[PDB]
Design an enzyme around this catalytic site. Structure first.
Site, short mmCIF file in Angstrom:
data_model
loop_
_atom_site.label_atom_id
_atom_site.label_comp_id
_atom_site.label_asym_id
_atom_site.label_seq_id
_atom_site.Cartn_x
_atom_site.Cartn_y
_atom_site.Cartn_z
N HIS C 60 -37.44 77.64 -50.43
CA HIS C 60 -37.72 78.42 -51.62
C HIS C 60 -38.30 77.55 -52.73
O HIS C 60 -39.23 77.96 -53.42
CB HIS C 60 -36.43 79.11 -52.08
N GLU C 63 -41.97 76.82 -51.91
CA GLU C 63 -42.84 77.97 -52.14
C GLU C 63 -43.22 78.08 -53.61
O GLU C 63 -44.36 78.41 -53.94
CB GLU C 63 -42.14 79.24 -51.66
#
Ligand SMILES: CCCCCCCCCCCCCCCCCC(=O)OC[C@H](COP(=O)([O-])OCC(O)COP(=O)([O-])OC[C@@H](COC(=O)CCCCCCCCCCCCCCCCC)OC(=O)CCCCCCCCCCCCCCCCC)OC(=O)CCCCCCCCCCCCCCCCC
Ligand SMILES: CCCCCCCCCCCCCCCCCC(=O)OC[C@H](COP(=O)([O-])OCC(O)COP(=O)([O-])OC[C@@H](COC(=O)CCCCCCCCCCCCCCCCC)OC(=O)CCCCCCCCCCCCCCCCC)OC(=O)CCCCCCCCCCCCCCCCC
Ligand SMILES: CCCCCCCCCCCCCCCCCC(=O)OC[C@H](COP(=O)([O-])OCC(O)COP(=O)([O-])OC[C@@H](COC(=O)CCCCCCCCCCCCCCCCC)OC(=O)CCCCCCCCCCCCCCCCC)OC(=O)CCCCCCCCCCCCCCCCC
Ligand SMILES: CCCCCCCCCCCCCCCCCC(=O)OC[C@H](COP(=O)([O-])OCC[N+](C)(C)C)OC(=O)CCCCCCCCCCCCCCCCC
Ligand SMILES: CCCCCCCCCCCCCCCCCC(=O)OC[C@H](COP(=O)([O-])OCC[N+](C)(C)C)OC(=O)CCCCCCCCCCCCCCCCC
Ligand SMILES: COC1=C(OC)C(=O)C(C/C=C(\C)CC/C=C(\C)CC/C=C(\C)CC/C=C(\C)CC/C=C(\C)CC/C=C(\C)CC/C=C(\C)CCC=C(C)C)=C(C)C1=O
Ligand SMILES: CCCCCCCC/C=C/CCCCCCCC(=O)OC[C@H](COP(=O)(O)OCCN)OC(=O)CCCCCCC/C=C/CCCCCCCC
Ligand code: HEM
Ligand code: HEM
Lengths: 95, 69, 454, 54, 84, 176, 354, 79
Positions: C60, C63
């Site tokens: 995460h 990203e």
């Protein structure tokens, strides 16, 4: 209970638990009405029985006269059977 | 204020009355069977036996008395 | 019972999806459409599941920082270039799959491939960018800053998959978020973002040959493969409760109940899609043309009648599939005093699939399932998500005609067989947030998966 | 005099005079003759074309 | 468009047949309960039948020799004529 | 499985009678036997038995209505659901007079009195409820067909309702 | 339960237009209580080993025991008179048309009452008692070994009396419970009125209806006290004061007056089982009188010709039961049975349209 | 295949009052857009649980009224 429209209440005060049945028989009166009465303590309490007495019995009897023909036919059957029974007994037993 | 506005209810407004339908079906069935039993035993049965006796008059179908079944 | 084929001539009139495997192992899939806009992206097989407990949250973090500058470009230059093309770079990361796509005009298809390749292959994970994102991620991580639907979605996985990595959350625990550094992200890129796990999807006024030539040029230096993933047992479904009883968050209670579902490639997956459509969804604030009291959906109709008020402020079914497991259930948002009626009614509805499901409800559900699916394929990004997700899930894209052909075979009897085998008398997981005095014990709710009648 | 017909109903059973019943209507009900005064309400309006003028 | 209305009117023409089928399917789902009802009846009514019917009804598993050592009619323990 | 075979038989039969004309909408000619029976029995039976008996009952009913000062359509009981659904939609002017007539009738009947003859010259058999009874039957038939074509399964004895179909709470003995 | 009493007695609303025929139900409830109370008291002195000598002991030796003996016997006659009149009332106004649940709850109490009254008659332990039960029990001789289980012997004995006494003691208590289901349905499903329609003229029960109901129940008490102390009507057959002799039958074998209708049905039909089935038909067939109707009407307040013929038919059948089994009576009785069937068919059949 | 839309279709107009396709911004990410892709702050997946109806929940609001009650009136034992 009455129809849903009839028992639909206007007020938001909750129905008391002891008046549940009383408010299930509510009616929605269209057009309003004026109700008037007097306490029985200030009225004649037996005259209405006498005033209505003759018309009450006239209409009762005219309605019950509808059963005149049926009752006579049943009564005619009652008589035939009773005397058909007597003749049968005598024929079978009496000499 | 004034009279309430007309509005139709949101149905269906019927149903849930199956116990009454079972009672109807149960009662009709019993009385129909009673009708057959009463009609057969009270009226048809004796007449059939009388007809049976008439055929016996032929005597070719007489029932054996020594059969002792 | 079989009522015929619903496949039409129009279903066959769709441009084919051409999938080719580049020598490095990257699949390139394209579908031509008569549009002036396109969607080009990379759908990669990666996510929180493939992270270890200590490193959970790295994917995460990566990203969010991937588009914040590259070795060749800078954050301002990259953002300026995309804006000049009239495009917008998007991205997301999930438990099992990740995507990095660009919505662009026709002239920007090939330029966007270059930008996306540079970000994925040469990310400049500057420390300043990482530290600023750490603050943002930390704020996001707080439960007060999350919606109750998001909380329950994570807690359903935490409760159901205690023994395996599918229980991990995408954002990760706060302890890991505090410690993630550039090296963590560099390792994750090296191990997971490899050609064998990537699919380049282009939808729009595109030519398959040209996209393939550009892809081979720009992704030439990608790592060809990484070692095969560890072999693991079927994820064990733990029947458990994870309920956050809070009477200081208002009247609404949020409940999610889950059953063990099926993997993507299961022969029964389409049956579970149809069962999800039969459960349907309802909202007191968006009832639609048909009111709840007269709905064809049986769960909705019985619910609307309860106490003359209705026992469902909102509910939806859910069918979540992973490579080797799935979750099937419903989510409810309802008044505190209504929770027992709501969970009881939505469980009675699921149990009914095993006993008494009418052909009428199935046929309605097939049509509303098809409407949802086909309408999702209207825009290029919808098509691109479908191509990328399907190739990762199945290795191929199922055509609309094939989906309808297989759905035609499914009937009330097939739903009953699948539900009897998998959902009847099955184990369940319950999760919750909010005022939940009405919610009963798990064992009490687990007895509602079968009927004394029939 | 009254407009009611004393013999509106026939067959075995106890005598009764009423105007209405519960029976279902056909999807293609007989077209009412509103020109003569016949009542048009319910299926005979919706599932017919009596309401149509020129 | 009248044709469309005709189809929409007519799609419920066969309501009585469809509601009959619905109840026939509820009755189909209730047939399995016979598997427990009938044996329970014969289980409670077993003592009512005569001995030869008790033996046949149980395929010969039950017979007079299977009556308890202390039969409720003690004069018939071990047989109708007693033990000896 | 024999149920599957039975299901196919039902499907094929019903498919073979779709669009059939109802018996009442067929132009039917009486058989040569029913015509003879109508020629002989029906006229004599009407002259001697049916005609006089039914006139006797009808004339009595008209008198009873006139004595109460009510119309025939007033006599309908709202415990019947079609009547209740029709009464929901009647216009207010019709409603007001209906209520007043019904109230006067009950007072007269309860006190064993009859309407003065001055007020009795009216036709009691005017069908003022007919438009609304027909609308109510249409509304109920639509609901029957589109919403009640199957015996539905619901959770039992929950929310004050048995779960067997009734919609009012506490409307049976077992839901007290 | 003082708020339940207040909701069903004090603030319970009923129409003003009801007649005294709506007072019958209240009378049944009150006399039923009396019958239970006098029964319990009578059992403080009664001897079940010899019911014949127990009655003598109560009448002669117990202080005011004659009151208990005669009230229990005579009040049973009053229970059936009032209940049958209530049934006739319900048939006349066709209260079963919409309040069928009330009709069903009532019929259950009717079925229980039939069993209660019959067994009680047996507890007298006289000639008619012994021979009445012997005749009725033989109707079920078709079912194997059923008579032996019920009687407890090969002939009626004190063994049978002991077990029937328990049913007579307990079943009336269950009947009282069913009276609560009957009143529950009456209060929820509002009562019918003398007019067909529903009108807004209701008044509270305690201040108006209860006063009128007491006037009716006191008027019936003036009549019941005359019968109780002076026997102005013969309501108990004298043959039940003869000691039982199992070898000699009495002059006639008949039940109390309130079972005469069913007694004649059996005596009339030639086949024994057919007679039993016709008895079943009469009570059950009246439970579905309105089920086949299709019109919006309750058939109320017409000339009620069929009703009147049916009531007279009950009376004539009761009359035939009293008479000996003469052949001529048998023929006429059979015509009445056929006539009754036709009347019921008139009730059931819906009408076609001209 | 994946389902990309909620099981409850919106049924409303996508464009806001007075705003056209030209002047609505980019419907894919604009804040006022009714079809904007939700932001995956916590990751992708929760949209399967999400309630897309913009109106906030009003707990206990009545939808089971068949016309038997006026607003503000409390039913007592269903009647
Ligand atoms: C040729 C041969 C022919 C032979 C003839 C005989 C044929 C055999 C069968 C006969 C029996 C048929 C039974 C029918 C069952 C119907 C079921 C049904 O649908 O019910 C609901 C249905 C209601 O319909 P619905 O409103 O549509 O249902 C929707 C609602 O949800 C419904 O819900 P609802 O709430 O509105 O209604 C429910 C309703 C249903 O109930 C009823 O209406 C009654 C139903 C049962 C009837 C009684 C059966 C008796 C028979 C069994 C016993 C035999 C013993 C024998 C022993 C022999 C020993 C020697 O009420 C109740 O449930 C009341 C329950 C009260 C219980 C109270 C118990 C006491 C308190 C609690 C316990 C104690 C306290 C604790 C103590 C603890 C100690 C520490 O009931 C009815 O309407 C029918 C009621 C019955 C009417 C009469 C039936 C007549 C039958 C025709 C044949 C008659 C022949 C003549 C007989 C003569 C006898 C002397
Ligand atoms: C007018 C036009 C022309 C008319 C033509 C008529 C045509 C029909 C007639 C011809 C029928 C042919 C049938 C062919 C059968 C094929 C058999 C075969 O290959 O099997 C495949 C066939 C189907 O296999 P499948 O494809 O997997 O489908 C499974 C379903 O069963 C599939 O069933 P489903 O899903 O469709 O559900 C319905 C199901 C279930 O349907 C029902 O059960 C209907 C229930 C309706 C309600 C009934 C209420 C009670 C009514 C009583 C009325 C009594 C009145 C008395 C009157 C007396 C005065 C007159 O039906 C069956 O199971 C089929 C039955 C097949 C025949 C065998 C059973 C017949 C009954 C025998 C009774 C015997 C009583 C003796 C009494 C003795 C007294 C002393 O196998 C079976 O399931 C058949 C057997 C069913 C059970 C029967 C009982 C077995 C008992 C075993 C005892 C073992 C004892 C062990 C002791 C060990 C000690 C150590
Ligand atoms: C020689 C040897 C011969 C041997 C022969 C052997 C023969 C064996 C015979 C075996 C028995 C066969 C009986 C066949 C009856 C057929 C009647 C018929 O045509 O029904 C159509 C009829 C449909 O009518 P409809 O006008 O089209 O629509 C009805 C509604 O208005 C609107 O309908 P809707 O569909 O719009 O409404 C929705 C709702 C409509 O729901 C209803 O209609 C239900 C109605 C209320 C039922 C509850 C009543 C209250 C309780 C009564 C009992 C009280 C005491 C119990 C305990 C006593 C303990 C001491 O439907 C559902 O909920 C569908 C699912 C229903 C099943 C749920 C399962 C769980 C609950 C369990 C109870 C129900 C089991 C099924 C019925 C069993 C029938 C026997 O359905 C029913 O009759 C429903 C069942 C009601 C009767 C229940 C009786 C239970 C047993 C009582 C004891 C009986 C003793 C007397 C002798 C028994 C032997 C005969
Ligand atoms: C020769 C002639 C023969 C004639 C045969 C006639 C037979 C008639 C028999 C009638 C029996 C009726 C049983 C009904 C049971 C209750 C109703 C029901 O099913 O409710 C469904 C409803 C609805 O269930 P559900 O399907 O909604 O379940 C939802 C989820 N759970 C399972 C968690 C509740 O069941 C209940 O809620 C009731 C509780 C369960 C009751 C289970 C049965 C009780 C058994 C009693 C034990 C003693 C038996 C002894 C017998 C001895 C042998 C003689
Ligand atoms: C379509 C074709 C179908 C058939 C396919 C072929 C396979 C099946 C064919 C079976 C036929 C043969 C049946 C033999 C029956 C013998 C009965 C007999 O002699 O009983 C005497 C017994 C005992 O007779 P007894 O009462 O005189 O006892 C005398 C006792 N001593 C010697 C001590 C004095 O009689 C009974 O028990 C009477 C009831 C008979 C049992 C019910 C009928 C027969 C059931 C057969 C079951 C077969 C399954 C396998 C065995 C199960 C038990 C373990
Ligand atoms: C010969 O001359 C003749 C007469 O005179 C002799 C006649 O009277 C008559 C007419 C007579 C009659 C119509 C009635 C005859 C009555 C008889 C034979 C009664 C015989 C005795 C019984 C039936 C007692 C057995 C009692 C019962 C079965 C209970 C009866 C009530 C029922 C079934 C209604 C509902 C059920 C109950 C109330 C039972 C309740 C059960 C419980 C509480 C059990 C609880 C158990 C547990 C474990 C909790 C004729 C025709 C005649 O010919
Ligand atoms: C939901 C409501 C449910 C209500 C249920 C009620 C309770 C039911 C109780 C079931 C009891 C089952 C019967 C028990 C019988 C016991 C048998 C036994 O032990 O035998 C004793 C002894 C044994 O003697 P033997 O010398 O061996 O010779 C006998 C002949 N071979 O005598 C007998 O067996 C006699 C048994 C007679 C039984 C008669 C059975 C038939 C009765 C019909 C009942 C009909 C009821 C109808 C009710 C309808 C209600 C609407
Ligand atoms: C509706 C309720 C009842 C009725 C119809 C009724 C009916 C009768 C009948 C007719 C008699 C015999 C009359 C005579 O001897 O000729 C009798 C006797 C008897 N009853 Fe009842 N009874 C009922 C309730 C009760 C109750 C509740 C009990 C006990 C708690 C009871 C106990 C007795 C006793 C002990 C006898 C024997 C005394 C006798 O010879 O009269 N009864 N019953
Ligand atoms: C133990 C016997 C019973 C008692 C205690 C009893 C009591 C009552 C009472 C108090 C009422 C209400 C007031 C009234 O209308 O007078 C009534 C109503 C009613 N009863 Fe009974 N009852 C009994 C027997 C029966 C029987 C056997 C039937 C049916 C054959 C029956 C059917 C009815 C009906 C239909 C009503 C409704 C009256 C109406 O609508 O006006 N009752 N009963």
């Amino acid at each position: 209970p009455n129809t849903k429209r009839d028992i639909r209440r206007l007020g938001s005060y909750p129905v008391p638990p002891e008046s549940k049945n009383f408010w299930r028989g509510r009616f929605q009166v269209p057009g309003g009405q004026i109700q008037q009465g007097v306490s029985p303590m200030q009225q004649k309490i037996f005259f209405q029985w006498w005033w209505n007495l003759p018309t009450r019995y006239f209409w009762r009897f005219t309605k019950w006269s509808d059963f005149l023909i049926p009752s006579l036919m049943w009564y005619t059957g009652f008589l035939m059977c009773k005397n058909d029974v007597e003749e049968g007994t005598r024929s079978r037993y009496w000499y | 204020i004034g009279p309430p506005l007309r509005t139709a209810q949101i149905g269906p407004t019927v149903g849930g009355n199956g116990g009454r339908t079972f009672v109807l079906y149960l009662t009709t069935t019993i009385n129909v069977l009673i009708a057959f039993q009463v009609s057969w035993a009270c009226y048809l049965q004796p007449r059939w036996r009388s007809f049976r006796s008439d055929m016996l008059e032929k005597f070719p179908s007489l029932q054996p008395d020594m059969d002792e079944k | 019972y079989y009522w015929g084929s619903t496949v039409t001539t129009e279903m066959h009139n769709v441009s084919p999806t051409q999938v080719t495997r580049l020598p490095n192992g990257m699949r390139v899939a394209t579908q031509f459409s008569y549009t002036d806009s396109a969607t080009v992206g990379l759908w990669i097989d990666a996510g929180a599941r493939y992270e270890t407990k200590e490193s959970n949250g790295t994917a995460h973090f990566l990203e969010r920082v991937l588009y914040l500058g590259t070795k060749n470009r800078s954050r301002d230059q990259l953002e300026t270039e995309v804006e000049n093309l009239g495009a917008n770079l998007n991205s997301y990361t999930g438990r099992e799959q990740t995507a990095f796509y660009a919505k662009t005009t026709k002239d920007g298809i090939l330029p966007c491939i270059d930008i996306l390749a540079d970000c994925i292959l040469n990310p400049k994970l500057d420390g300043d960018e990482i530290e600023k994102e750490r603050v943002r991620i930390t704020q996001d991580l707080q439960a007060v800053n999350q919606s109750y639907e998001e909380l329950l979605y994570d807690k359903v996985h935490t409760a159901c998959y205690r023994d395996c990595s599918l229980g991990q959350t995408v954002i990760g625990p706060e302890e890991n978020v505090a410690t993630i550094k550039r090296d963590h992200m560099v390792n994750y890129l090296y191990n997971n973002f490899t050609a064998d796990r990537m699919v380049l999807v282009a939808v729009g006024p595109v030519d398959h040959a040209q996209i393939v030539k550009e892809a081979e040029k720009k992704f030439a230096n990608i790592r060809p493969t990484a070692g095969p993933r560890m072999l693991e047992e079927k994820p064990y479904f733990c029947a458990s409760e994870l309920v956050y009883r809070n009477d200081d968050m208002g009247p609404t209670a949020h409940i999610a109940i889950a059953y063990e579902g099926v993997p993507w490639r299961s022969p029964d997956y389409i049956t579970f899609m149809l069962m999800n459509a039969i459960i349907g969804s309802y909202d007191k604030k968006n009832e639609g043309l048909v009111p709840g009291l007269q709905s064809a959906n049986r769960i909705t109709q019985t619910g609307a009648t309860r106490m003359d008020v209705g026992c469902f402020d909102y509910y939806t079914g859910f069918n979540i599939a992973y490579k080797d497991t799935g979750l099937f259930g419903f989510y409810i948002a309802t008044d505190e005093v209504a929770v027992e009626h709501a969970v009881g009614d939505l469980m009675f509805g699921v149990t009914s699939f095993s006993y008494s499901l009418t052909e009428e409800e199935v046929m309605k559900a097939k049509r509303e399932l098809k409407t949802n699916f086909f309408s999702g394929l209207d825009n290029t990004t919808g098509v691109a998500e479908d191509i990328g997700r399907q190739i990762l899930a199945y290795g191929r894209r199922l055509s609309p005609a094939e989906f309808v052909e297989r759905l035609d075979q499914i009937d009330s009897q097939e739903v009953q067989r699948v539900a009897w085998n998998r959902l009847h008398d099955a184990e369940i997981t319950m999760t919750g947030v909010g005022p939940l005095h009405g919610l009963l014990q798990l064992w009490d709710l687990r007895r509602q998966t079968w009927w004394w009648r029939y | 005099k009254t407009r009611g017909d004393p013999h509106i109903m026939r067959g075995w059973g106890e005598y009764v005079y009423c105007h209405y019943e519960h029976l279902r209507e056909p999807v293609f009900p007989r077209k009412p003759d509103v020109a003569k005064g016949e009542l048009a309400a319910g299926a005979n309006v919706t599932r017919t074309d009596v309401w149509k003028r020129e | 468009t009248l044709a469309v209305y005709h189809r929409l009117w007519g799609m419920t023409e066969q309501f009585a047949a469809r509601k009959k089928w619905g109840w026939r399917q509820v009755y189909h789902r209730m047939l399995p309960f016979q598997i427990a009802l009938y044996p329970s009846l014969m289980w409670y009514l077993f003592g009512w039948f005569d001995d030869p019917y008790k033996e046949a009804m149980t395929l010969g598993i039950w017979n007079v020799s299977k009556r308890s050592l202390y039969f409720w009619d003690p004069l018939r323990s071990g047989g109708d004529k007693g033990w000896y | 499985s024999f149920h599957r075979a039975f299901a196919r038989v039902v499907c094929n039969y019903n498919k073979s009678i779709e669009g059939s004309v109802p018996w009442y909408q067929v132009k039917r000619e009486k058989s040569p036997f029913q015509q003879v029976w109508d020629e002989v029995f029906t006229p004599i039976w009407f002259k001697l038995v049916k005609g006089p008996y039914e006139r006797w009952e009808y004339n009595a009913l008209v008198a009873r209505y006139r004595g109460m000062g009510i119309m025939a359509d007033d006599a309908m009981n709202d415990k019947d659901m079609i009547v209740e659904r029709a009464l929901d939609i009647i216009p207010e002017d019709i409603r007001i007079q209906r209520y007043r007539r019904m109230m006067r009738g009950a007072v007269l009947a309860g006190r064993k009195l009859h309407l003065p003859l001055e007020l009795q010259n009216y036709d009691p058999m005017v069908p003022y409820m007919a438009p609304y009874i027909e609308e109510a039957k249409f509304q109920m038939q639509e609901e029957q067909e589109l919403l009640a074509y199957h015996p539905w399964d619901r959770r039992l004895y929950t929310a004050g309702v048995s779960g067997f179909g009734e919609t009012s709470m506490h409307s049976t003995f077992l839901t007290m | 339960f003082i708020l339940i009493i207040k909701d069903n007695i004090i603030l319970y609303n009923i129409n003003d237009s009801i007649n005294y025929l709506w007072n019958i139900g209240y009378i049944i409830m009150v006399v039923m209580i009396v019958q239970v109370i006098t029964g319990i008291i009578i059992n403080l002195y009664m001897n079940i080993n010899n019911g014949y000598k127990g009655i003598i002991y109560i009448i002669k030796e117990i202080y005011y025991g004659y009151i208990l003996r005669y009230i229990h016997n005579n009040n049973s006659t009053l229970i059936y008179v009032v209940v049958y009149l209530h049934i006739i009332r319900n048939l006349y106004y066709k209260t079963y048309y919409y309040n069928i649940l009330i009709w069903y709850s009532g019929m259950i109490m009717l079925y229980q009452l039939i069993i209660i009254g019959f067994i009680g008659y047996i507890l007298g332990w006289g000639q008619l008692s012994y021979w009445g039960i012997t005749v009725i029990i033989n109707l079920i001789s078709g079912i194997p070994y059923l008579i032996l289980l019920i009687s407890g012997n090969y002939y009626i004995t004190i063994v049978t009396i002991k077990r029937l006494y328990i049913v007579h003691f307990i079943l009336p208590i269950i009947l009282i419970y069913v009276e609560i289901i009957h009143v529950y349905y009456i209060h929820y499903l509002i009562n019918n009125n003398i007019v067909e329609y529903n009108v807004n003229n209701k008044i509270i029960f305690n201040n108006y209806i209860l006063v009128k109901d007491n006037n009716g129940i006191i008027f019936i008490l003036n009549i019941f006290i005359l019968e109780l102390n002076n026997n102005i009507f013969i309501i108990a057959d004298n043959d039940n004061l003869i000691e039982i002799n199992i070898l000699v039958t009495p002059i006639h074998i008949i039940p109390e007056w309130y079972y005469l209708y069913w007694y004649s049905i059996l005596k009339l039909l030639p086949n024994k089982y057919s007679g039993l089935y016709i008895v079943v038909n009469s009570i059950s067939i009246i439970n579905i009188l309105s089920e086949y109707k299709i019109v919006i009407s309750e058939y109320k307040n017409y000339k009620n010709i069929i009703w009147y013929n049916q009531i007279i038919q009950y009376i004539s059948m009761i009359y035939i039961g009293i008479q000996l089994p003469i052949i001529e009576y048998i023929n006429y009785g059979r015509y009445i049975i056929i006539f009754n069937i036709l009347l019921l068919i008139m009730y059931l059949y819906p009408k076609k349209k001209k | 295949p994946p389902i990309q839309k909620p099981l409850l279709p919106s049924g409303r107009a996508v464009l806001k009052h007075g705003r056209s396709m030209l002047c609505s911004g980019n419907l894919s990410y604009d804040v006022n857009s009714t079809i904007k892709a939700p932001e995956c702050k916590r990751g992708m997946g929760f949209t399967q649980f999400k309630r897309f109806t913009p109106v906030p929940i009003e707990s206990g609001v009545s939808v089971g009224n068949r016309g038997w009650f006026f607003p503000g009136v409390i039913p007592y034992q269903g009647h």
